[PDB]
Design an enzyme around this catalytic site. Structure first.
Site, PDB file in Angstrom:
ATOM      1  N   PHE A  63      75.907 -60.389 -27.271  1.00 43.44           N
ATOM      2  CA  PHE A  63      75.835 -61.731 -26.713  1.00 43.44           C
ATOM      3  C   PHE A  63      75.328 -62.727 -27.746  1.00 43.44           C
ATOM      4  CE2 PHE A  63      75.197 -59.126 -22.827  1.00 43.44           C
ATOM      5  CZ  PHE A  63      76.303 -59.559 -22.122  1.00 43.44           C
ATOM      6  N   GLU A  64      75.560 -64.000 -27.446  1.00 42.55           N
ATOM      7  CA  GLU A  64      74.976 -65.087 -28.219  1.00 42.55           C
ATOM      8  C   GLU A  64      73.472 -65.123 -27.979  1.00 42.55           C
ATOM      9  OE1 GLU A  64      76.500 -68.964 -26.977  1.00 42.55           O
ATOM     10  OE2 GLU A  64      76.421 -68.260 -24.897  1.00 42.55           O
ATOM     11  N   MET A  65      72.717 -65.435 -29.028  1.00 39.35           N
ATOM     12  CA  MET A  65      71.265 -65.518 -28.926  1.00 39.35           C
ATOM     13  C   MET A  65      70.869 -66.858 -28.315  1.00 39.35           C
ATOM     14  SD  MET A  65      68.387 -63.820 -29.796  1.00 39.35           S
ATOM     15  CE  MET A  65      66.649 -64.255 -29.756  1.00 39.35           C
ATOM     16  N   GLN A 106      68.258 -51.438 -22.367  1.00 37.88           N
ATOM     17  CA  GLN A 106      67.449 -52.328 -23.181  1.00 37.88           C
ATOM     18  C   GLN A 106      68.294 -53.457 -23.757  1.00 37.88           C
ATOM     19  OE1 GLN A 106      64.038 -49.660 -25.275  1.00 37.88           O
ATOM     20  NE2 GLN A 106      66.124 -48.849 -25.456  1.00 37.88           N
ATOM     21  N   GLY A 109      65.612 -53.300 -19.025  1.00 30.01           N
ATOM     22  CA  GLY A 109      65.960 -53.239 -17.621  1.00 30.01           C
ATOM     23  C   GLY A 109      66.225 -51.813 -17.183  1.00 30.01           C
ATOM     24  N   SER A 110      66.624 -51.679 -15.915  1.00 30.05           N
ATOM     25  CA  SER A 110      67.094 -50.393 -15.409  1.00 30.05           C
ATOM     26  C   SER A 110      68.396 -49.987 -16.088  1.00 30.05           C
ATOM     27  CB  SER A 110      67.278 -50.458 -13.898  1.00 30.05           C
ATOM     28  OG  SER A 110      68.222 -51.460 -13.568  1.00 30.05           O
ATOM     29  N   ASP A 115      72.501 -62.493  -8.074  1.00 28.97           N
ATOM     30  CA  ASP A 115      71.125 -62.208  -8.496  1.00 28.97           C
ATOM     31  C   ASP A 115      70.559 -63.373  -9.301  1.00 28.97           C
ATOM     32  OD1 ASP A 115      68.907 -60.371  -8.381  1.00 28.97           O
ATOM     33  OD2 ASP A 115      69.225 -59.957 -10.521  1.00 28.97           O
TER      34      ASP A 115
HETATM   35  C1  LIG Z   1      66.516 -63.785 -25.806  1.00 26.00           C
HETATM   36  O1  LIG Z   1      67.804 -64.103 -26.253  1.00 26.00           O
HETATM   37  C2  LIG Z   1      68.846 -63.651 -25.433  1.00 26.00           C
HETATM   38  C3  LIG Z   1      70.152 -64.107 -25.645  1.00 26.00           C
HETATM   39  C4  LIG Z   1      71.203 -63.663 -24.831  1.00 26.00           C
HETATM   40  C5  LIG Z   1      70.957 -62.758 -23.802  1.00 26.00           C
HETATM   41  S1  LIG Z   1      71.914 -61.977 -22.607  1.00 26.00           S
HETATM   42  C6  LIG Z   1      70.646 -61.111 -21.881  1.00 26.00           C
HETATM   43  C7  LIG Z   1      70.718 -60.154 -20.704  1.00 26.00           C
HETATM   44  C8  LIG Z   1      71.877 -59.448 -20.446  1.00 26.00           C
HETATM   45  N1  LIG Z   1      71.907 -58.623 -19.421  1.00 26.00           N
HETATM   46  C9  LIG Z   1      70.867 -58.434 -18.633  1.00 26.00           C
HETATM   47  C10 LIG Z   1      69.679 -59.112 -18.844  1.00 26.00           C
HETATM   48  N2  LIG Z   1      68.553 -58.898 -17.946  1.00 26.00           N
HETATM   49  C11 LIG Z   1      67.272 -58.331 -18.350  1.00 26.00           C
HETATM   50  C12 LIG Z   1      66.982 -57.901 -19.789  1.00 26.00           C
HETATM   51  O2  LIG Z   1      66.425 -58.202 -17.532  1.00 26.00           O
HETATM   52  C13 LIG Z   1      69.598 -60.004 -19.902  1.00 26.00           C
HETATM   53  N3  LIG Z   1      69.535 -61.411 -22.537  1.00 26.00           N
HETATM   54  C14 LIG Z   1      69.659 -62.308 -23.593  1.00 26.00           C
HETATM   55  C15 LIG Z   1      68.596 -62.753 -24.411  1.00 26.00           C
END
Ligand SMILES: COc1ccc2sc(-c3cncc(NC(C)=O)c3)nc2c1
Length: 342
Positions: free
Chosen positions: A105-107, A39, A35-36, A154
């Site tokens: 974060f959690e996956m 990563q 993202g901006s 958003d």
């Molecule tokens: C693909 O498994 C995951 C699990 C948890 C998270 S939390 C997150 C995230 C956090 N902050 C901003 C954004 N926004 C973007 C990258 O565009 C995503 N991604 C994931 C992906």
């Protein structure tokens, strides 16, 4: 030459390298998003023995402060939601590493855009849309906790992740552009497709802007296409007017940017400014959903839970979410009690 002893790039991001080991704990696997802000990487946590998603913020003061506001909101939410039952992505911890703020974060699984993409933008069924609608309303009810009063600001399919590919559970990610209720500081908020009229009109706004976004999101999940796919704000408003008609006069009289979109005729009524589009309220949502014609594109004909009675419960709920007035637009608590979730 070299930025942060070669660790960063020109854009202040950390140069992610497959298989690198951080702090003798996190084994970096691969880049999953960018993202901006910076990563997002997939990594394995050797202490907890589980996969995590790490948001690596850029090494720059503007994003570090922004990320800190997200960290404040998530740690405040985690305090209230201990039992992990309000459909928000869990922040496990955060740490500084080579001048980068990292959020663990959690996956989760793919996002709701990816599901739409795998259908070739044809959409999912109404049964699955109900389950996403029920969980999202519960999540917005959690954000509407008075001590929270959090606006995501958003909401879109990309920022909604599935917990597990083989289950219907979803979690909301990405509170980087989110804020708590208060005085208006920002007017250019939300992504254009999901942007509420009050924001388009430059008016005061609250947590109900998330409910507008949700209304747009739920129709897109079933039809597969954005409800209002504006190429600019003037296009966005015209497509909103196509479906829902001209906003009420008492709103447009208070809207500062009302004359960006409408003209006020000498008699007091508001009209669209000439620029194409169907007359206001003629592109009926009844016809978009295909309540009487077997769903979107007739592709739901004969499928369970896809009767006219079921579509009218969904149509009614969605219309209550796309109310122009944020004071009368439906709230999470009442939406959950709707006949559509029966
Ligand atoms: C693909 O498994 C995951 C699990 C948890 C998270 S939390 C997150 C995230 C956090 N902050 C901003 C954004 N926004 C973007 C990258 O565009 C995503 N991604 C994931 C992906």
């Amino acid at each position: 030459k070299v930025y942060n002893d070669g660790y960063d790039d020109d854009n202040y991001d950390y140069i992610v390298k497959n298989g690198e080991k951080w702090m003798d704990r996190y084994e970096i696997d691969s880049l999953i998003g960018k993202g901006s802000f910076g990563q997002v990487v997939k990594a394995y946590d050797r202490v907890e023995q589980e996969w995590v998603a790490i948001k690596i913020i850029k090494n720059k003061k503007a994003f570090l402060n922004q990320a800190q506001i997200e960290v404040r909101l998530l740690e405040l939410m985690n305090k209230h939601d201990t039992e992990m039952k309000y459909y928000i992505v869990h922040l496990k911890r955060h740490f500084m590493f080579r001048n980068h703020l990292c959020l663990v974060f959690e996956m989760l699984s793919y996002n709701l855009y990816d599901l739409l993409r795998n259908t070739n933008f044809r959409g999912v069924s109404l049964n699955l849309t109900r389950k996403f609608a029920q969980q999202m309303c519960t999540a917005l009810l959690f954000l509407a906790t008075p001590e929270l009063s959090i606006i995501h600001c958003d909401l879109k399919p990309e920022n909604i992740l599935l917990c597990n590919p083989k289950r219907s559970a979803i979690k909301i990610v990405d509170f980087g552009s989110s804020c708590q209720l208060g005085q208006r500081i920002y007017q250019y908020i939300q992504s254009r497709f999901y942007r509420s009229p009050e924001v388009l009109l430059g008016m005061p706004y609250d947590l109900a802007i998330d409910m507008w976004s949700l209304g747009c999101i739920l129709v897109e999940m079933h039809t597969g296409e954005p409800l209002f796919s504006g190429a600019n704000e003037v296009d966005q408003m015209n497509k909103i007017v196509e479906v829902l008609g001209i906003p009420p006069a008492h709103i447009l009289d208070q809207a500062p940017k009302a004359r960006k979109f409408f003209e006020k005729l000498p008699d007091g009524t508001w009209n669209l400014k000439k620029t194409e589009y169907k007359p206001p309220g003629t592109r009926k949502l009844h016809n978009i959903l295909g309540v009487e014609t077997g769903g979107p594109g007739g592709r739901r004909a004969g499928e369970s839970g896809h009767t006219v009675a079921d579509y009218l419960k969904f149509k009614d709920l969605i219309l209550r979410m796309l109310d122009y007035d944020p004071k009368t637009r439906i709230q999470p608590y009442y939406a959950l009690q709707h006949s559509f979730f029966k």
